[PDB]
Amino acid sequence: PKYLPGKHPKNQEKTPHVDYNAPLNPKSELFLDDWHIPKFNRFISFTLDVLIDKYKDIFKDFIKLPSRKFHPQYYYKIQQPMSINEIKSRDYEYEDGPSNFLLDVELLTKNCQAYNEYDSLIVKNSMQVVMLIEFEVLKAKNLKRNYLINSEVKAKLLHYLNKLVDATEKKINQALLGASSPKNLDDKVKLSEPFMELVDKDELPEYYEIVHSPMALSIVKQNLEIGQYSKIYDFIIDMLLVFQNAHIFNDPSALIYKDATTLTNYFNYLIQKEFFPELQDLNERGEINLEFD
């Protein structure tokens, strides 16, 4: 491996200040919607235990606090050290619990990025730790619209998948800015191009060292067909996984990283502004079976 495990300290004179209160994505529905899960503390320990079992070798450097014995200077540079054990020991059953839980979870990557070189296995793993926890929260938060994927829901989800796949810079800006969209924007190149297939293991072996749950749009499409996704949010998470992995792997200045952001925003737009209101419209006129478990 080119990416060796454990810490890779920056060792710089002025270590960056970690803003506890700034969410990684301040526009995330997880921070803007008022939601609470009954018995949130039980949900947290259950969810965190499942994730640790399923992803041991990603979660493992984040379970306990960094060792003061081996890394004493961690405690001089990091103002609010955090771990999964610490999060599990806390009470989040009060009014700001949900967002304090999320900000506590984000500290895991924020601290990691403050202490360690950006391009290191440990940093990319901290990103994935946060991503995966936030995926479970997103699903649970959306219980009341996390309908079973029966035949007609599947057809609707295919429709919006195809629509995203075919989206060009012109289509997206139109949708996202409307009457404020700049003119002369490209209407031939599909932004999804580089997200359709998995990069070859032989041409880019480090991809698979870094990205622990690889996912491509053609695979999401195959999975939807065969019945891998039983609820709407199983499909949504995998879609979000495609673009998020590009944020994990690529440099923030890379054009593919930018396209991943754009396609994430367009996808959220399609789900929130087209797909769910359509399901509701169909439901109100008796045309679709919307159901839970």
Side-chain angles (χ1 to χ4, degrees), residues 30-31 35 97-107 134 137:
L30 291 180
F31 283 100
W35 59 271
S99 81
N100 289 343
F101 166 77
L102 292 170
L103 294 172
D104 281 4
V105 169
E106 298 185 358
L107 234 29
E134 288 195 349
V137 180

Side-chain angles (χ1 to χ4, degrees), residues 97 123 180 207 223 243 273:
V123 165
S180 299
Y207 184 87
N223 282 343
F243 312 123
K273 264 44 192 148

Side-chain angles (χ1 to χ4, degrees), residues 181-197:
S181 184
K183 48 213 84 290
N184 302 114
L185 276 162
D186 180 85
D187 202 12
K188 32 109 184 302
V189 181
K190 302 178 185 207
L191 267 74
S192 64
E193 213 49 64
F195 305 105
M196 295 307 291
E197 308 301 346

Side-chain angles (χ1 to χ4, degrees), residues 62-268:
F62 308 99
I63 289 166
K64 295 176 185 258
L65 290 172
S67 173
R68 165 145 15 207
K69 175 162 79 151
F70 286 89
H71 308 275
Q73 41 281 114
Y74 188 80
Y75 292 95
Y76 285 95
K77 289 164 173 277
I78 306 303
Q79 276 250 319
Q80 305 173 33
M82 194 54 55
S83 65
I84 280 146
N85 282 174
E86 163 101 73
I87 293 162
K88 284 167 70 182
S89 82
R90 280 170 179 204
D91 187 353
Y92 297 100
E93 291 180 13
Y94 56 94
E95 179 64 35
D96 286 342
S99 81
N100 289 343
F101 166 77
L102 292 170
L103 294 172
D104 281 4
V105 169
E106 298 185 358
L107 234 29
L108 295 170
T109 192
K110 293 183 183 177
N111 284 345
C112 198
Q113 288 174 55
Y115 196 70
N116 297 287
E117 297 292 12
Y118 183 79
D119 185 17
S120 70
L121 191 46
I122 195 167
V123 165
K124 305 307 186 176
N125 280 347
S126 71
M127 280 170 179
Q128 293 171 88
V129 166
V130 171
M131 174 186 72
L132 289 164
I133 303 177
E134 288 195 349
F135 280 171
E136 294 303 311
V137 180
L138 183 64
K139 288 196 222 169
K141 182 222 180 228
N142 286 290
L143 181 78
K144 294 301 200 67
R145 65 185 180 178
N146 187 23
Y147 309 120
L148 272 45
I149 298 174
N150 58 25
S151 201
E152 31 269 299
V153 177
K154 183 139 125 190
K156 296 294 156 183
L157 288 171
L158 212 214
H159 173 78
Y160 292 101
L161 170 46
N162 283 166
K163 199 164 167 173
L164 178 127
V165 166
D166 293 342
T168 55
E169 194 73 17
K170 182 254 196 71
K171 292 168 186 313
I172 296 166
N173 273 244
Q174 224 95 344
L176 292 188
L177 304 172
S180 299
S181 184
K183 48 213 84 290
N184 302 114
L185 276 162
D186 180 85
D187 202 12
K188 32 109 184 302
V189 181
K190 302 178 185 207
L191 267 74
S192 64
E193 213 49 64
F195 305 105
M196 295 307 291
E197 308 301 346
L198 287 176
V199 68
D200 193 289
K201 224 285 173 211
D202 304 286
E203 78 200 5
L204 203 53
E206 48 267 291
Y207 184 87
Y208 296 101
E209 304 177 14
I210 295 297
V211 179
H212 301 290
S213 304
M215 197 59 238
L217 299 167
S218 57
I219 304 168
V220 179
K221 196 181 171 166
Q222 297 173 334
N223 282 343
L224 184 64
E225 178 176 3
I226 68 169
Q228 274 301 122
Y229 307 137
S230 57
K231 290 145 198 169
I232 295 174
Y233 277 80
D234 305 323
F235 161 91
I236 287 173
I237 289 333
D238 269 21
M239 288 292 288
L240 291 179
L241 178 60
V242 173
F243 312 123
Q244 201 81 295
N245 286 164
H247 290 153
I248 279 47
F249 186 73
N250 292 274
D251 183 277
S253 61
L255 295 175
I256 187 170
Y257 186 107
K258 251 77 172 150
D259 287 346
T261 300
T262 302
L263 279 180
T264 301
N265 290 337
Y266 191 56
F267 179 63
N268 170 250

